[PDB]
Assembly symmetry: C2
Homo-oligomer: 99 residues x 2
């Protein structure tokens, strides 16, 4: 749909059989979710933001649904205050910025 | 315009009579810019990002332009890796997410 930015762009997403809240973040290269259990092997990955770099866990080819749109891609797990949906998944559901 | 997310949404902004590249960040509550110069009162402020915290200078009622679109609001100046446009200004230029 069309989401305004008066408030944080939090939408529902589903991963596994679980409903979660996540932020549509055009400023995130990657998708970062709050600590949770995911299937299969992982590899380490260093990411950064204001504040510095940080090492987190990287899981690949993870099915995820965002506002009813299915996507598959890399998901990172780390100490984030919120579930973040980044550009790697946003492009997959055809999400764009407009003004 | 309509901006896809295959690459970082960098756009031209103008502040203090100077043009610059800045990231359209729907995941940012605030607007933070790389060390520069600004007028009027400023007061410190600590803010958090994915790698920890940084102390910045908060400036209120700062006129700024994004792609020539006028906005006025709070702007933080500090050691950020890159200029970040937050929702506080994006709402002001009618920027929305679509998919
Ligand atoms: C959530 C993060 C994955 C996000 N960071 C990113 O997308 C960064 C630029 N990319 C990134 O961390 O790519 C993996 C990496 C990291 C370090 C060294 C080598 C490789 C972030 O902190 N995003 C914030 C904005 C921001 C952007 C750029 C720089 C600093 C803060 C809010 O949107
Ligand atoms: C550009 C920054 C102003 C932006 N920071 C914020 O949005 C601020 C005001 N929110 C914020 O700080 O939220 C809580 C917090 C508290 C303590 C430490 C870290 C985080 C940022 O880096 N945002 C990223 C998300 C994020 C925020 C905090 C921590 C980790 C990741 C991407 O959306």
């Amino acid at each position: 749909p069309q989401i305004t930015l008066w408030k944080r762009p939090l939408v529902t997403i589903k991963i596994g059989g679980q409903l979660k809240e996540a932020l549509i973040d055009t400023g995130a290269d990657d998708t970062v979710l709050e600590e949770m259990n995911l299937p299969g092997r992982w590899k380490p990955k260093i990411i950064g933001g204001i504040g510095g770099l940080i090492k987190v866990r990287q899981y690949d080819q993870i099915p995820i649904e965002i506002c009813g749109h299915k996507a598959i891609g890399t998901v990172l797990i780390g100490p984030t205050p919120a579930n973040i949906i980044g550009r790697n998944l946003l492009t997959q559901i055809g999400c764009t910025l407009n003004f």
